[PDB]
Amino acid sequence: REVAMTDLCPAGPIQAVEIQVESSSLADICRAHHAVVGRMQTMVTEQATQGSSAPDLRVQYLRQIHANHETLLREVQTLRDRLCTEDEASSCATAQRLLQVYRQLRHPSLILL
Amino acid sequence: CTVLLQIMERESGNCPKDRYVVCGRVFLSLEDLSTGKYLLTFPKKKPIEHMEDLFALLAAFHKSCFQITSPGYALNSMKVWLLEHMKCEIIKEFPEVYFCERPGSFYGTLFTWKQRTPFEGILIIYSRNQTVMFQCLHNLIRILPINCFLKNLKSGSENFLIDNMAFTLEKELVTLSSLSSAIAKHESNKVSGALYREITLKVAEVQLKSDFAAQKLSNL
Amino acid sequence: IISKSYKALINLVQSEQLVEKIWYRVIDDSLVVGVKTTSSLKLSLNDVTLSLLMDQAHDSRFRLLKCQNRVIKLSTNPFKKECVQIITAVTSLSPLLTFSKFCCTVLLQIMERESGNCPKDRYVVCGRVFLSLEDLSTGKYLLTFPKKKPIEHMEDLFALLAAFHKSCFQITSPGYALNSMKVWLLEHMKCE
Amino acid sequence: LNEAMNVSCALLSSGTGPRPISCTTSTTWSRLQTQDVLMATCVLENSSSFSLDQGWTLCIQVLTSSCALDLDSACSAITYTIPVDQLGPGARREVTLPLGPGENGGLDLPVTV
Amino acid sequence: LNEAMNVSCALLSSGTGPRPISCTTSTTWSRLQTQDVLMATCVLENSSSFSLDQGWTLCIQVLTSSCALDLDSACSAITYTIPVDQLGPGARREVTLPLGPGENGGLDLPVTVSCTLFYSLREVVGGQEGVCLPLSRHTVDMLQCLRFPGLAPPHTRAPSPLGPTRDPVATFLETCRELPPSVASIKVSA
């Protein structure tokens, strides 16, 4: 579907096309995301060296994205340190939380502008 | 038969490296078998001292990988079930392989036992069909503790897959923090869409790793 | 009333034992079922088969089950005189040991060939095999070689004449006589 | 049981069209590995109201050539037996079988399934 | 050796779109027994005059999931191979080999078929080993694997597969011993 987003771009929300996938199995989401990201890598590297580049805002939302990424980065680092120390509940809730982080990140992923 | 070993690089998405090697040639004849020389035919070739012969087992035998946890209790009854009940010989050369010599319907079966964190071990069954892998878990489940949680493993152990997932996500989150930090010095010096594209390609290259490790974990 | 109605179905469809008995062995990863005929059932006149059928109580899922059909004719002490025709199925085991256990039922189907009406499509339920891992862990049905060299339950011969890859060769020695066979068999091959 | 009697009675009567349950089979070439294999689709269809519940099972038998010989063949016939579960009215299954040369490049034709 | 040199030049040189020799790798669904299975038709085509005569052989090699897994998989990959015997001008052949579900929906999907030819003279007469030309490396993604039963052209009653509720070895183990939809998305410039 088409989704125009004004607080990404400074002037013109291009009417950026969003691509979604919903399933019971997170495995099939991993796979179909993996496939599509592959196809977008291909398209963007064949279009680059010919196509131009739009400007961004530089402000507010790239910083929102920085903050919400840095909290999860330090959380993953604390989780890795805990996995190295090996106290108790070796890796069950750790897996269940890491995959929560994964799902959280995947829903918006690579707004390409 | 000519033998041909192809080598492909993963890291380079250019398919640049398609190196082939020719590692020699196999001749074989009905006479050469008629006179043994190559064959593995059982109990005569019990004392395993040509390691090629071990390797031709661990190739042609159906394998099956199993996670074991006795969570509130240490696990050493494995070592007794292998050496006394199943009547195993350790191969000295490779002391992590056990060859079953009990002389009814487990003869010529091989195991391996990595006991990492003596609660949480891992057991791998090379067998001469499936019915023999079943006969074994049956016979094993009989001897284990009450809490002992078996599990089938297609594609590696849970500790390694969580480490793989953790690494791929830490890398990706580092790349996105890097995106925003490269934007946050451009502000001090409106963004180059070219720069944004350049960094999204690196982020894509790490996202493909996280998606892969996630499909490994989400089946388990 | 339920019992009345079971028997009612069976009399709805419609004495002489067409079939001696059921027997079975486990070869390695092969189940062999076999049944011994009586003189009444003539394999000259009747194409027969045999199936196995899984208990859906155990089999919650649609696995198709495949069963290979072999007919075995052995002459008994020829040197009237007894022919022994037996009929036998083979399938894979490991698929059926999913639940530690199963019970299959055994269905011998018979169809005439001479009458082109397809008139006579009789069947019979020849019995039921229970099998488990506590059975096989105690041997009891296996054939495990050389311990079970001295062949004295003929079911165990019939299991090996089922399971095995059969191949028939003609031998013509056209400028000799051919007697070297028995020696090759008894001396070079060391046949009982 | 009631329904079973009713299906059975329906089947065993010759109403001049085999209404209640049908089972058509039909030949199809496929390709495997290198060789053209000959497959048979078995379509089971429920036309009538009667839902074929649990307790039902389909048996297929694939009879080779006729005339029992001097030498009893390798494989006289093959049999295939599948649970039909909750078929229902209008509803339908399909099963594919090979008949085809797996041994020897040798298929002998007049074959009944 | 002439024909080898002529063909080998024709492939590697002329860095253009249309080669003389091709290896097109599709995917298909066909039905066996009860399951559906995933086929790769590999179609080898000889659009040139060169006639791959003899001593030419074709190695297809099907690589699974790509990662350094700790224990290992029972089957890292497969490979096939075939003497290509005459294969004159315009002519072609086809080879269906399964990728399809390994034992319990067991199908990790990045999966590449990678074709190669292989010329060795050691075949005809020697004197010195052999040569591997690559040829189509296609990958299979998830998105070719998806099948659309409700949307389908026929609108025919195919039964819903409902892939197996456990592994056979898992059911064995449970017997012997006794929610929201996940989502992902992307945005991209019109």
Curated annotation (Swiss-Prot), chain C:
It is linked to Fanconi anemia complementation group B: A disorder affecting all bone marrow elements and resulting in anemia, leukopenia and thrombopenia. It is associated with cardiac, renal and limb malformations, dermal pigmentary changes, and a predisposition to the development of malignancies. At the cellular level it is associated with hypersensitivity to DNA-damaging agents, chromosomal instability (increased chromosome breakage) and defective DNA repair. Some severe FANCB cases manifest features of VACTERL syndrome with hydrocephalus. This is Fanconi anemia group B protein. The chain holds residues 418 to 683 of 859 of the full protein. It is found in: Nucleus. GO terms for biological process: interstrand cross-link repair; negative regulation of double-strand break repair via homologous recombination; positive regulation of double-strand break repair via homologous recombination; replication-born double-strand break repair via sister chromatid exchange. Belongs to the multisubunit FA complex composed of FANCA, FANCB, FANCC, FANCE, FANCF, FANCG, FANCL/PHF9 and FANCM. The complex is not found in FA patients. One of its GO terms (cellular component) is chromatin. Keywords: Acetylation, DNA damage, DNA repair, Fanconi anemia, Nucleus. The lineage of its organism: Eukaryota, Metazoa, Chordata, Craniata, Vertebrata. The gene is FANCB. DNA repair protein required for FANCD2 ubiquitination. It comes from the Eukaryota.
From Swiss-Prot, chain D:
Belongs to the multisubunit FA complex composed of FANCA, FANCB, FANCC, FANCE, FANCF, FANCG, FANCL/PHF9, FANCM, FAAP24 and FAAP100. Forms a subcomplex with FANCB and FANCL. It is found in: Nucleus. It comes from the Eukaryota. Plays a role in Fanconi anemia-associated DNA damage response network. Regulates FANCD2 monoubiquitination and the stability of the FA core complex. Induces chromosomal instability as well as hypersensitivity to DNA cross-linking agents, when repressed. This is Fanconi anemia core complex-associated protein 100. The chain holds residues 486 to 598 of 881 of the full protein.
